[PDB]
């Protein structure tokens, strides 16, 4: 369908990082799927993501930096070369930001 777009900027914290898990990558495909593009695996509960992403978001951009058909290791040091601040521009399903949406 078309998908939801939003833009982020996180800050780090201790332990946490960002607070979040990437998969994902044109070298890293869905066991299923077979999709390539680069996700938010998790969201760390109590981390400076929870509010912010959400689980299965795809990742477009990450300060400025494309995240369209890059390799999984590319996006994961683009993330944590990051400094204080990460910003973020994510791709989501239509009501994604509830746990529950049915079509009718």
Do not use: C
């Amino acid at each position: 369908m078309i998908w939801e777009q939003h833009t982020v900027t996180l800050h780090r914290a201790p332990g946490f990082g960002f607070g979040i898990a990437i998969s994902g990558g044109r070298d890293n495909p869905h066991f299923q799927s077979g999709e390539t593009s680069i996700v938010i695996s998790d969201v760390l509960k109590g981390g400076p993501a929870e509010g912010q992403l959400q689980e299965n978001d795809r990742v477009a951009m990450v300060n400025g930096v494309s995240m369209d058909n890059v390799e999984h290791a590319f996006a994961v040091q683009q993330l944590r070369k990051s400094g204080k601040n990460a910003k973020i521009t994510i791709r989501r399903k239509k009501g994604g930001g509830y746990s529950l949406t049915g079509y009718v």
